[PDB]
Symmetry: C3
Subunit: 136 residues, 3 copies
């Protein structure tokens, strides 16, 4: 309908990450409005409203048994997940959120311990989201 904002993004992870750092998904497939920045890993809200996000982060198979990944809004964790495998086999840390955001809010995925697989261009580890409703 006229006036509905179109805001959506989807990016994969080319480079491996470990420890406690923000995941800079840099294989950008969709980025309507350029509100996702692959140089920072952050989606920045431009319109107050209700947003969906999801993430799938592949643990570094063959090199460790656990890896944690959090979805953050500004300075707060809003979703958490753990990948774990006693044989160091591949496993995912994945979760999804629905959040109200205000302009300037940042949403991003941060590692919270362990090692993440670096996918080159294969998009094994991903971050995506979109606006569901704009506030009146």
């Amino acid at each position: 309908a006229p006036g509905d904002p179109k805001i959506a993004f989807y990016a994969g992870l080319k480079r491996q990450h470990e420890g406690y750092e923000v995941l800079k998904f840099d294989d950008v497939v969709t980025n309507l409005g350029n509100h996702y920045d692959p140089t920072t890993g952050k989606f920045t809200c431009s319109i107050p409203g209700i947003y969906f996000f999801t993430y799938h982060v592949l643990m570094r198979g063959g090199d460790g048994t656990s890896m944690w990944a959090d979805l953050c809004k500004n300075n707060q964790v809003r979703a958490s997940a753990i990948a774990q495998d006693a044989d160091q086999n591949y496993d995912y840390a994945s979760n999804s959120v629905v959040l109200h955001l205000e302009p300037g809010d940042e949403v991003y995925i941060k590692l919270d311990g362990g090692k993440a697989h670096g996918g080159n261009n294969n998009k094994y580890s991903t971050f995506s989201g979109f606006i569901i409703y704009a506030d009146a």
Copy 2:
């Protein structure tokens, strides 16, 4: 647009909970329209339409047996997620659905073979969903 139904929720889980009747996600982050009730663990439809739901449940079961988390619509399973590990008690059970619902329908998560854990921040086990289209 203004006037169109805005219905969306997201909830985590405080501490560890059995869910063999219903898993009552009780850390409610988003509940636009208040169609999710943390005291019953159910999302109740009030508008005919198409709805998305997803869940990510961190479960702990007995050594070496399968466990599962089912998304139910009324008395029917509409998705399931199964996990089994040889000597790892904690694993995720996650799935996603798109469902047509009528007023009165109840959508919720039920567990078997293990207990759900919210982790320290309540955000490791989650349930979310929203209306995609309203029947008109």
Copy 3:
């Protein structure tokens, strides 16, 4: 506002490099998903969400790969793995711009996918988020 959305589960075992034919169809608004091919075919330009959750078969192998493809190109990859040949899932999600005729589907890239019968363990769903003009 166009209404296009689907959701289906995998009844039968698949293996190797074949397309996954999710044939336990729960939702298929607009009839744009074909359970006999496993493919969603775009009918109007726009922005679409898809997600999949594919269960690896137990007791016959330790790895399985399942990739979401757009036309003949991988747009998301996933691996399931369990060294004791127990279950594991290969899952991912995407947001894609599509044009009419574009096909979106899940294809194996090695390994065996569990045939769930009516259990809806292994799933594929999607919907249009915004239509183009």
